[PDB]
């Protein structure tokens, strides 16, 4: 029944949709193509910032990172404007989450160490949380310039939602670090037309979005009902038949979020 509605959405948008909301004490898990792989795009930036927080002392946030104009490979609304000053690990965190800054992310990986510019260390951090499915192989970008059917740089709605659940609602991070991550996602500036648009205004929403080629659009959120009940919502889509230059349908993610809201309501 729910599946049928999701399918209609799939038809209505010429897209592939993947949805997952973890089960709770009173609601069954919601799932559509929950175990199929979808490109991370920038959604990794969120558990990345938790990788960075887990590993180091709070104090580490103040550490200044220096980079050059050639380090700027991808959309960098913030890092582009600070080549002269550089940014603390804290300002990098903030921008990788709230503005989806491609360079801020590229830096924070590095700051994680080891082969793959940091991607092994990052996939290392996912594993540590029980996620054996997801994998980040490449750096920003290219991460969103893979072919449909390529398993590098992918995750599932299932896998990312359980991760996000531990970060924000669970015990993955000490409380101090927990509120840093959560507060940064609550003030995300890139998601107003996604999960957040599909839910009544009186539900609180935090999230981190992802966008890529082949009409890739993702959104991962934690929502709070008017009464304070939290749920984790993972919504992912691509439109492979439109090819590389296919356009991401944001209204797909907003609608699927409305279907989800009605079922949680
Ligand atoms: C996230 O994926 C992001 N953008 C891209 O990767 C990207 C988008 C479009 C074309 C090429 C690459 O950086 C990885 C940032 N996040 C968003 C977002 O909506 O959350 C973007 C829309 C683009 S920048």
UniProtKB/Swiss-Prot annotation:
GO CC term, one of those recorded: periplasmic space
Mainly localized where? periplasm
Question: What residues form the catalytic site here?
Answer: 42, 140
Marked site, Increases nucleophilicity of active site Ser, at: 45
Q: How is its activity regulated?
A: Is inhibited by clavulanate.
Q: Where, subcellularly, is it found?
A: Periplasm; Secreted
InterPro entries linked to this entry: Beta-lactam/transpept-like (IPR012338), Beta-lactam_cat (IPR045155), Beta-lactam_class-A (IPR000871), Beta-lactam_class-A_AS (IPR023650)
Instruction: Please give the SUPFAM superfamilies that the UniProt record associates with this protein.
Output: beta-lactamase/transpeptidase-like (SSF56601)
Q: Which residues bind substrate?
A: 100, 209-211
Site positions per UniProt: Functions as a gatekeeper residue that regulates substrate accessibility to the enzyme active site: 75
- For the keyword Flavoprotein, the answer is no
Write the Enzyme Commission number(s) for this entry.
3.5.2.6
Q: Which Gene3D superfamilies match?
A: DD-peptidase/beta-lactamase superfamily
Offer one Pfam family short name for this entry. Answer: Beta-lactamase2
**Which branch of life, at top level?**
Bacteria
Recorded GO terms, molecular function?
beta-lactamase activity
Mention any additional remark.
Answer: The class A beta-lactamase family has a specific amino-acid numbering system, sometimes called Ambler or ABL numbering and often misspelt as Amber. A multiple sequence alignment was used to derive a consensus sequence and then the consensus was numbered taking into account insertions and deletions. This allows use of identical numbers, e.g. for active site residues, despite differences in protein length. UniProt always uses natural numbering of residues, hence there appear to be differences in numbering between this entry and some papers.
Q: What is the documented function of this protein?
A: Extended spectrum beta-lactamase (ESBL) that inactivates beta-lactam antibiotics by hydrolyzing the amide group of the beta-lactam ring. Displays high levels of penicillinase and cephalosporinase activity as well as measurable activity with carbapenems, including imipenem and meropenem. Plays a primary role in the intrinsic resistance of M.tuberculosis to beta-lactam antibiotics.
Tell me the subunit arrangement: Monomer.
The family assignment reads: Belongs to the class-A beta-lactamase family.
* Protein's UniProt name: Beta-lactamase
Query: Per the UniProt entry, what species is this protein from, by scientific name?
Result: Mycobacterium tuberculosis (strain CDC 1551 / Oshkosh)
């Amino acid at each position: 029944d729910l599946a049928d509605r999701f399918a209609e959405l799939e038809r209505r948008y010429d897209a592939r949709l993947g949805v997952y909301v973890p089960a709770t004490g009173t609601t069954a898990a919601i799932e559509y193509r929950a175990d199929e792989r979808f490109a991370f795009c920038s959604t990794f930036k969120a558990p990345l910032v938790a990788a960075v927080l887990h590993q180091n002392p709070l104090t580490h946030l103040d550490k200044l990172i220096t980079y050059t104009s050639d380090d700027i490979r991808s959309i960098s609304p913030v890092a582009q404007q600070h080549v002269q000053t550089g940014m603390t690990i804290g300002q990098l965190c903030d921008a990788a989450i709230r503005y989806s800054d491609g360079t801020a992310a590229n830096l924070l990986l590095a700051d994680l160490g080891g082969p793959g510019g940091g991607t092994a260390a990052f996939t290392g951090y996912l594993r540590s949380l029980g996620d054996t499915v997801s994998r980040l192989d490449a750096e920003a970008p290219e991460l969103n310039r893979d072919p449909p059917g390529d398993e590098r740089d992918t995750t599932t709605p299932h896998a990312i939602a359980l991760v996000l659940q531990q970060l924000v609602l669970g015990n993955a991070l000490p409380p101090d670090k927990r509120a840093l991550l959560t507060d940064w996602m609550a003030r995300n500036t890139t998601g107003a037309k996604r999960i957040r648009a599909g839910f009544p205004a009186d539900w609180k929403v935090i999230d981190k979005t992802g966008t890529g080629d082949y009409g890739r659009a993702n959104d991962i959120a934690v929502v709070w009902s008017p009464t304070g009940v939290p749920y984790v919502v993972a919504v992912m889509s691509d439109r492979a038949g439109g090819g590389y230059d296919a356009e991401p349908r944001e209204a797909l993610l907003a609608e699927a979020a409305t279907c989800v809201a009605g079922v949680l309501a």
